[PDB]
Amino acid sequence: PHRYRPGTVALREIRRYQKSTELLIRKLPFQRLVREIAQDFKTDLRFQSSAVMALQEASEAYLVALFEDTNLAAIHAKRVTIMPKDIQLARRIRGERA
Amino acid sequence: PHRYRPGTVALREIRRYQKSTELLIRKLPFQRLVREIAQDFKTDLRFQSSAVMALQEASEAYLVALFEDTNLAAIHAKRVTIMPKDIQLARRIRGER
Amino acid sequence: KVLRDNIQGITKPAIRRLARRGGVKRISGLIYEETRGVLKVFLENVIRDAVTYTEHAKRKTVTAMDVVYALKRQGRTLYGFGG
Amino acid sequence: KRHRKVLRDNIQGITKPAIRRLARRGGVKRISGLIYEETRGVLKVFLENVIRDAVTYTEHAKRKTVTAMDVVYALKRQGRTLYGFGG
Amino acid sequence: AARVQEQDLRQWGLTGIHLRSYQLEGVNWLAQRFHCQNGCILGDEMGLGKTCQTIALFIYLAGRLNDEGPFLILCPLSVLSNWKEEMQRFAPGLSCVTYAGDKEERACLQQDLKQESRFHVLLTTYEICLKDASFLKSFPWSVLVVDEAHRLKNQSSLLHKTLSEFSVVFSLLLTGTPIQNSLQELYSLLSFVEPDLFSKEEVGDFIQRYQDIEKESESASELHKLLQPFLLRRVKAEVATELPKKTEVVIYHGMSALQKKYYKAILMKDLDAFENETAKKVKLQNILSQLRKCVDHPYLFDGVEPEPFEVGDHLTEASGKLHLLDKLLAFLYSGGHRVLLFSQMTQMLDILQDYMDYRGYSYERVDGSVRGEERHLAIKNFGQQPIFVFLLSTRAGGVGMNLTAADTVIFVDSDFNPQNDLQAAARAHRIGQNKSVKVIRLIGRDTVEEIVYRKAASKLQLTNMIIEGGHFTLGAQKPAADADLQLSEILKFGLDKLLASEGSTMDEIDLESILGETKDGQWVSDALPAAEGGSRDQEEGKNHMYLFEGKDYSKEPSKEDRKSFEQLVNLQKTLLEKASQEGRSLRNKGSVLIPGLVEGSTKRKRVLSPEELEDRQKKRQEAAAKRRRLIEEKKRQKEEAEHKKKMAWWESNNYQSFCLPSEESEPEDLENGEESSAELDYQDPDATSLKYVSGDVTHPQAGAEDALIVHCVDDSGHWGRGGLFTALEKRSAEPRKIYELAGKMKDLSLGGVLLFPVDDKESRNKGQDLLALIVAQHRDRSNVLSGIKMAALEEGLKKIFLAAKKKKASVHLPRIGHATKGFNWYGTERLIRKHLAARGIPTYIYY
Amino acid sequence: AKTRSSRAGLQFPVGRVHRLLRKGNYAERVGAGAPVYLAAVLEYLTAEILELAGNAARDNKKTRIIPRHLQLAVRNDEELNKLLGRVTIAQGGVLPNIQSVLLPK
Amino acid sequence: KTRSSRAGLQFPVGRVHRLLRKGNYAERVGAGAPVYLAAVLEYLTAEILELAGNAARDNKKTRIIPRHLQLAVRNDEELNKLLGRVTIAQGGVLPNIQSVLLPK
Amino acid sequence: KTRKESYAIYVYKVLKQVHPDTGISSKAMSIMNSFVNDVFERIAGEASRLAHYNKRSTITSREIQTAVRLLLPGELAKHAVSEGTKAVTKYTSA
Amino acid sequence: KTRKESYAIYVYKVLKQVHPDTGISSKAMSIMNSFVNDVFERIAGEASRLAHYNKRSTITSREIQTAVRLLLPGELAKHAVSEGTKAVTKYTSAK
DNA sequence: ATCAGAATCCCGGTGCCGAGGCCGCTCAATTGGTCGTAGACAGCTCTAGCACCGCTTAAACGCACGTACGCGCTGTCCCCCGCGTTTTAACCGCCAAGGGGATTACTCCCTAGTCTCCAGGCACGTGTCAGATATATACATCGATAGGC
DNA sequence: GCCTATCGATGTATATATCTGACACGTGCCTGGAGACTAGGGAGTAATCCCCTTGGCGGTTAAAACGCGGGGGACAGCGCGTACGTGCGTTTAAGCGGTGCTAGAGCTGTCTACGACCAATTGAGCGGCCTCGGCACCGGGATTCTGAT
């Protein structure tokens, strides 16, 4: 009947993904996403593989940093479940949501 | 006798200063503060009054923007009263340490 | 030959892994769409500039240097690419 | 009795009402009492970095008088450009 | 009793003075001649306290001969105050009453003196004595005193006649000039003094018999033998000392290890000035200031006081100069001496106040910031209150102050101009000083002050010696290149002693041995201590004005000290060299870092050959002269264009000028033939003196001649309300109209005088009245008015002299400030008298 | 006319711009068309901003433009507020704004 | 003979000088200026590298990798300050969990 | 006496175009001048970088346009690019 | 057939100074090379701007020292400055 | 409470291709000479920031409790997680077109640099009227009022 | 427990009030923008190799897809009772107003050391490649954690 309690293995997951250094995003889906957005500015573009890798790296670092700020904002509200309201405050305070 | 209720005058003040274009810090105290701090850097420094004036303008703008962000943080935290914890969070999100 | 929807490919599990690296213990189901929206805006601006640089370079192929310049203009930087 | 007197530090001259008044322009309705010293600390650190930079410019310029453009350069370098005192 | 004892005179009530060898002899001569019953003349030179000696004579008469008076004193008003003061302070037992003032005041005094008839001594002036001779005759006189009796040089004088009409038994005439180049003065005095021995008719025989004494030694001996009972006169410094002889002291002090710390640090910091011969001027000058501060006090440097900034002895420990001064002040305080402290750095005076507070000493401070009235208060306080020390900035104190109450003068640091020190000395060691004054200059032994002083002293004593001796042997003004070398020599001095003793060399010195005898808290005026003569082969060793403690200044850095400097420079280079020679240093390792750029700081370059320096000097001179000349001419062209604007502005307003042009370039042709003193015979002092009348200034009491009324105004043309201005409107409304017109029409220029008639509403029965308004003030929005431009008053009076003589009109002036107590009337009065009354123009002053 | 600005139909000084660019070391050579294009762009933005400022002053019932109007104008052009997101204007003040949680009931 | 050798540098004096000229930074450039700059760059880098070396050693690796670089940068407060918006590929993140999220 | 220069007269002339019968305070003029110089530096700086990225010696309107595209907001850029192009095509007819 | 210079060799040289025994991955070498070149631009930009502010034609050690002090945050510069000036001293001392 | 029992490291041994080292030829870093301007460096001239007193009146200090907010503890209840369980196409290994980037080599115009000049921009110049300050509202919300329902 | 009023209190936008320096305009002059003349190498000029990305195949796997179940946090409710809002008075000192002072900013001139440009030349390091073992990686060792005891 043994089961780990809610949030306990989630902490182990945090420890896992904080100890690992590899990318967490699905590569081909991200590649398609790059091509998809670029499709809006120009049709039939070609992309250096390293450009896509750089984009993926930059995106992950950006999002992870956002998740951290979101985590703190939820904690400040005495919560542990992150919500868009936290993202909205963080982006506004950062001035990204200028 | 008469008294306005808590927050009624605060709302007036907010509207007054937001409507106003005036500086909010006393010039001479700010001026002395800068010069005392100058003692921390060098034994001898002269200062243009306009330089001090610019410094006050920048400082007030910086703090006011911070007060806005702090106010948002308190509201997000379901409060009306701002606290140091809000200021710290705001600066943290702004990448300030 | 036209692409769509793969933003959802940055699926709930993709977002969950990122959030765990970010130290997040619980993730609201509303966060997934909020993230995809913010990410698209971020990517659009970076790619927009990278394309601008590519066009300025008279190229048809986007290069890592365009990404580097775009980040740098946005005041961001990624070492280990180009150069 | 008048030859010398101890006096409060100039930072306190950024009086509780000066801080309150600023917060009110910032739209703050209610303020906890801990914020006066907290704001003073933030302001002092902010000023410290700006003045130090200004001093650096002036001393390189080998002047003795601090100049508003020196402040402009510091502000621009720190990403907080102010319009209204020079160019 | 031994010279009718000085104690007998004191027992008879003489207080507050020592009858000096000169004063005691005079009083006894007066007393002896009274025993002989021969009248007397005290012909002693001015400043010997003839007043003091005469007061002692009344003390002798009342105490020994029981002559209860009344005694009459005739004196000039400038000394009448002095007579009254000396009587009150030195002879309080004899009631001295003052008969002075205006006709109304004198009328009150005549009633008061008739009601309270119990005065021993009556003080009156010569002019009042002549006017009220009938009143003074009503009192039965015992003895008559005449101060500066030269007023009697003419027997036909009304003064001589009226006093000969007074009942006189014994006479004492005081004169600074018993012979003003005429024997008639001495005989006129002698015949007044003892008319029974010197008849009024023997004037011719006395003059004729004694006129050639410069040629006849025999006549010189005869006249003196005849005069010995009647005339006493003596010469200065030998007995007649009059001014307490000044004493000069140089004080040698040690320095603390802390001072030594900064010394080493300061010197080492800027070695480059010694390497770059051309960078020496600014650098060494800055350094010298720092060195001075270090010798004075290390806390003159920021952060040197240990935090917390607590008041304590650590201050004295930090400076050997202060350490010595503290001990010195304790001695002086116990000695009841009063000290004046002069320094160039106000910054130290601050610390000194802090120190006075620490020790709890009474002090006052006056530097260039203490304002004039505040300055009056400080002087007043020091004169009245037991203030021990006076803190003075050396440059601020030299201007006009009187500090004769102090006996001790200390120079912390010396001025660039020795004239400033000498000028300051005249403030305390001033005529009227009764205590012997001691003069102190502070020097650290083997310190920069000693070296600076060695050369500065040579210049300073030569300059001071030059000022009294008039032979200007001024040490030649060496160009700054040599002053840089001089500074390097100073910096090369004493290095061995200074650095080899890193600990405090603050020696305890028995001050009394250096200072000399103190009597009743007074410095004994002993000539500079010449190491006493032990006779065996005469060896000349300069115990002259430049030697104190037997030490001769002016002599150079030892060669070894010079060598040690150069060695230290290289040693410092070695430290820098090693640190730079040594490998890479990391931060986690916390290595020692070298400070900023070497050439970051600037280095001056090679000297253009002396020939090239000479050529560039010429080039510099030539370029400046050429531009100066061309620029000044072009600048004048601007003034010419502005003149066009001025004339056009006046012309455009159809205004007629009432202002007199500035007549400061006409030769005063008042009969060209040596301007020698036109001897004013003593007949009616009211005829050439300004006549003061109480009444309205606007209505001159002029008979049939034209009258010129004079008043001062500003350049605004806005007519005032109230006071004298209302009186002017009462006589005429036109002065207002012209003044309003002139101000608006830009006709009012500083020193300009508006002239227009006053006969508009009320005119005199004979003669024309003219009013002259002098443009002397301008009022800006800050409302600050300068004293009715003192310059404009002189120019206006010059114009008034020329206009009044040219029109032969009488001049009528208000007594400015008569209602303001302590108002400086004299400057205005003398200009009026010199330019009008003394030139025969009738001047009337209304109050 | 002589001036290149009038040839371009501009008010701004193309010659000054070309000089400044040459002196600014932005490159070894500066083509004559770059100053023209830049002068036109700066002039355009000037006109755009001045129009907003003119409106703000006129709306404020005043004939003279002041920094207060500039702050109001800049922040209300949402694009200028981002372009000038960290630029501060002397005597600009802030936009009147109060959060609904703080408003009375 | 090389100016770098003369300067005691690892860094290339001529190459650095060439970079300064082509960068259009000023009308004129002094010969010591590149020396100072090169030295500084050289300095800075090694300071980083020791710390980087420390991280690899602590990580039981003989060759330094980007992960070591990320950790090293953030741990020099000044490197993080200087590099506050710089990202390192395959750098990962700092290990950290908020006390509020930790178990009872 | 030392001669200075500023964009003030151009700003004022443009002011009378967008809004006749109105003036501008000296403080506001200083801000406008300050803004013009700032934007100038932003454009010139990036244009310099672009030229280096392409190793070009000569700056052209193409670089200016590219810098403008990068610096300006999404719609403001459209108007500015139109005006810059319009000016060049007008001038080049001379 | 194309030629491409880089600073890696000094990096490696330096590597052996800090850690004679330590090795380095290609990715790490690329990162540091990028890093060095980037900071060069930062410093040169400030020196340039400063010279412009001072209307000065020539960039010198003065500019290096002060640009450095602004950029290398506070004390970080101090360390660098001491070695920087030392090297220049060496260079100028030598001939 | 202590322990079983999920699930975390530690470890040996393997084997891949990357890191470190080799040489190569080119083109440029160091070696070698001339000019010239900048800056520097020194001079002289004058400005504005600085030290000081001064009265005034608004501000902050300092008063108090009332007030309502934020507090800690209350209870509710259903959602993100834990794990199973299902189902995906990403990742990965292999080949292979050809669009295109970067390489090569070349031409002519453009901009730079050239000299002479003049007209738009400015610093100094002078004035004036929109905005600043009066002053006393007229007129709106808030305070308690204060009722009635 | 309202909810409709209500006075009137304290305050606020408005009227018309008057006052002035900051806003305008130009003057007198210059200085640097233009209109010249001119050269040559920079950007465009085009051709080309051969490469990098895109195209392309299916396999095999981890991975994502989809759900149940639930207990703890997400969520709101409540009373506690302090502390922060407010208006009182008290007192300090910030402001607007001066004064005197000279440091130090400011321009100018002359020329030289420092670096610019030009050049010959050597050799640092350069492209292309080869060799060895730190590392990845795999199976499978031990250790230590949770919630179930």
DSSP chain B: ---PPTTHHHHHHHHHHHH--S--S-HHHHHHHHHHHHHHH-S--EE-HHHHHHHHHHHHHHHHHHHHHHHHHHHHTT-SEE-HHHHHHHHHHTT--
d(CA E480, CA E498): 27
Q: If you write DSSP's letter for every residue of E287-333 in order, what string do you get?
A: HHHHHHHHHH-GGGSTT-SPSS---STHHHHH-HHHHHHHHHHHHHH
* CB of E682 closer than 8 Å to CB of E158: yes
Least Cα distance to I51 among I37, I38, I64 occurs for I64
Q: Residue I41 is which amino acid?
A: E
Interchain proximity F50–H92, CB inside 8 Å: no
Is the distance from CB of E373 to CB of E401 less than 8 angstroms?
Answer: no
Contact between G70 and G91 under an 8 Å Cβ cutoff? The reply is yes
**Is A25 in contact with C26 (Cβ distance < 8 A)?**
no
The one-character DSSP state at G101 is G
Number of domains in chain D: 1
Residue G102 is assigned to a structural domain of this protein = no
Q: Which two tokens stand for residue C47?
A: 């790619």
Tell me how far apart the alpha carbons of residues I62 and E137 are, in angstroms, rounded to a whole number: 96
Instruction: Please give the annotated binding residues of E, written as ranges.
Output: 44-51
**β-strands E231-232, E363-366 pairing:** unpaired
Cα–Cα distance measured from residue F60 to residue F70, given in angstroms and rounded to the nearest whole number: 12
- Whether there are 3 or more C-beta pairs closer than 8 Å between A and F is yes
Distance in angstroms: CA A47, C1' K55: 14
Cβ atoms E406, E390 nearer than 8 A: yes
CB-based contact, B89 to chain A, within 8 Å: yes
Protein CA at D9 to nucleotide C1' at K92, angstroms: 15
Question: G96 in a domain, yes or no?
Answer: no
Residue showing tokens 């916390």 = E590
Q: Which of residues 49-68 of G touch E (CB under 8 A)?
A: 50-51
Peptide bond into E308 cis (omega under 30): yes
Check for a shared fold between E6-232 and E247-527+546-552: yes
- Give residue C66's Cα distance to chain centre: 14
Instruction: Quote the tokens at residue H64.
Output: 């200016």
DSSP 3-state helix, strand, coil percentages of chain I (rounded to 5)? Answer: 75, 5, 25
- The approach used to solve this structure was cryo-EM
CATH, residue G15? 1.10.20.10
Q: Are D17 and B13 in contact (CB under 8 A)?
A: no
Give how far E627 is from chain I: nearest CA, Å: 28
Instruction: Report the first-to-last Cα separation within chain E, whole angstroms.
Output: 57
SS3 at position A24: coil
- D76 in I contact zone (CB under 8 Å): no
What would the DSSP string read from start to end of G72-89?
HHHHSHHHHHHTTTEEET
Residue E496 near residue E562 (C-beta atoms within 8 A) = no
Mind listing the domains of chain H with CATH numbers? 1-93 (1.10.20.10)
CA distances from E327 to E324, E359, E414 (A): 5, 11, 22
CB E438 within 8 A of CB E375: no
Nucleotides of J under 7 A from a protein CB: 5-9, 18-20, 27-31, 38-45, 48-50, 52-53, 59-61, 66-71, 79-83, 89-91, 99-104, 110-113, 119-124, 130-131, 142-144
Which of G48, G34, G55, G39 is CA-nearest to residue G82? G48
Pairing mode of beta strands E408-411, E339-343? parallel
Residues with Cβ within 8 Å of F34's Cβ and at least 6 positions away in sequence, in order, are F18, F21, H47, H59, H60, H61, H63, H64
For β-strands E753-757 and E769-777, DSSP reports them as: antiparallel
Cβ(E356)–Cβ(E425) below 8 Å: no
Query: Residue H24 is inside which H or E element, if any?
Result: strand H23-24
DSSP structure class, residue E479: -
Nucleotide nearest to G12 (CA to C1'): J29
* 3 state SS for E626-687: HHHHHHHHHHHHHHHHHHHHHHHHHHHCCCCCCEECCCCCCCCCCCCCCCCCCCCCCCCCCC
Residue D27: CATH number of its domain: 1.10.20.10
User: Any chain D CB within 8 A of the CB of B72?
Assistant: no
The angle subtended at Cα E76 by Cα E75 and Cα E82, nearest 5°, is 75
All domains in chain A, ordered by first residue? 24-94 (1.10.20.10)
CB neighbour list of residue B1: distance below 8 Å, 6 or more residues apart:
none
What Rg, from alpha-carbon coordinates, does chain E have?
36
At residue E693, what are phi and psi to the nearest 5 degrees? -130, 135
Å from the E281 CA to the J43 C1': 15
Residue among F37, F39, F54 whose CB faces H15 most closely: F54
- Helices H26-53 and H61-71: angle between axes, nearest 10 degrees: 110
Which residue matches tokens 């913010």?
C38
In single-letter form, the type of residue at position G67 comes to: R
Domain locations in chain E as residue ranges: 6-232, 247-527+546-552, 691-846
What dihedral angle (degrees, nearest 10) is formed by the CA atoms of G4, G7, G13, G14?
Answer: -70
Q: What domain range includes position F46?
A: 3-88
Contacts of E756 (CB under 8 A, 6+ apart): E658, E734, E735, E738, E770, E771
* C-alpha span between G19 and B35 (Å, rounded): 42
Closest CA relative to residue D18, chosen from B88, B77, B39, B33:
B33
C-alpha to C-alpha distance for E448 and E437, rounded to whole angstroms: 28
CATH node for E691-846: 3.40.220.10
Q: Which tokens go with A7?
A: 């949030």
- Asked if the Cβ–Cβ distance from C24 to A70 is below 8 Å, we say yes
Show the tokens assigned to E807.
Answer: 């029109």
Superfamily of domain E6-232: Tandem AAA-ATPase domain (3.40.50.10810)
- Which chain D residues are closer than 8 Å to F67 by Cβ? 84
Among residues 2-41 of chain C, which lie with CB inside 8 Å of chain H?
none
Q: How many Cβ atoms from other residues are within 10 Å of residue A79's Cβ?
A: 17
How far apart, in whole angstroms, are the C-alpha atoms of residue G11 and residue G19?
13
Return the partners of chain H (3 or more C-beta pairs < 8 Å): C, D, F, G
Instruction: Establish if G100 belongs to a structural domain.
Output: no
Amino acid making up residue E306:
P
DSSP G29: E
Smallest Cα distance from G27 to chain F, Å = 8
> In the numeric block, which tokens belong to residue D20?
């309150």
Find the chain I residues whose C-beta atoms sit closer than 8 A to any C-beta of C.
6, 27, 30-31, 33-35, 37-38
Yes or no: say if G76 and I41 are a contact pair by the CB < 8 Å rule: no
Are the beta carbons of B37 and D47 closer than 8 angstroms? yes
Q: Does G26 contact F25 at a Cβ distance shorter than 8 Å?
A: yes
CB E218 within 8 A of CB E26: no
Q: What is the DSSP letter of E246?
A: P
* Sequence ranges of the binding site of E for ATP: 44-51
D64 part of contact set with chain B, CB < 8 Å = yes
* Tokens coding E675: 């301007």
Contact C68, A54 (CB under 8 A): yes
- Give the bridge partners for D31, in sequence order: B82
Closest CA to E440 of E354, E505, E523: E523
User: For residues E341 and E352, is the Cβ–Cβ distance under 8 A?
Assistant: yes
Residues β-bridged to residue E97: E122
Q: Give, in order, the Cα–Cα distances in Å from E190 to each of B4, E206, E681.
A: 101, 10, 19
Structure tokens at B92: 């943290």
| Chain K footprint positions (protein CB, under 7 Å) | 9-12, 22-25, 30-35, 42-44, 52-54, 63-65, 70-75, 83-87, 93-95, 97-99, 103-107, 109-111, 113-116, 123-128, 134-136, 146-149
Residues in chain I: 95
Domain count, chain G: 1
Closest-CA residue of G relative to E590 is G47
C62 CA from J100 C1′ (Å): 12
- What's the token pair of residue E208? 């004729």
- If DSSP codes are grouped into helix, strand and coil, which group holds residue I40? helix
- CA-nearest residue to B54 within chain F is F90
Q: Give Cα separations from F18 to F26, F30, F38 (angstroms).
A: 11, 7, 9
- Residue F105 located in a structural domain: no
CA atoms of D78 and A1, how far apart (whole Å): 59
Instruction: Answer whether F39's CB lies under 8 Å from F12's CB.
Output: yes
Which of G21, G22, G40 would you mutate first to test chain I, the one with the most I CBs within 10 A? G40
Instruction: Judge contact between E795 and E751, C-beta under 8 A.
Output: yes
Q: Is E815 helix (H, G, I), strand (E, B) or coil?
A: coil
Q: Which residues pair with E353 in a beta bridge?
A: none
CATH architecture label of E247-527+546-552: 3-Layer(aba) Sandwich (3.40)
- Residue among H6, H31, H38 whose CB faces D84 most closely: H31
Categorise residue E49: left if φ over 0, alpha if ψ from -120 to 50, beta otherwise.
left
Bridge partners, residue E588, by sequence: none
Chains that touch C (3 or more CB pairs under 8 A): A, G, H, I
Distance CA C22, CA A17 (A): 9
How far CA E170 is from CA of E26, E73, E234, E451, F8, in Å, comes to 16, 13, 22, 65, 116
**Domain that residue D23 falls in:** 4-87
Quick check: I38 and C80 CB within 8 A? no
Structure tokens at H70: 């990068």
Which nucleotide's C1' is closest to A3 (Cα)?
Answer: J82
Strands A81-82 and C26-27: parallel
3-state secondary structure (DSSP) of residue E611: helix
Dihedral in degrees, nearest 10, Cα atoms I66, I69, I71, I73? -170
Residue E379, strand partner residues: none
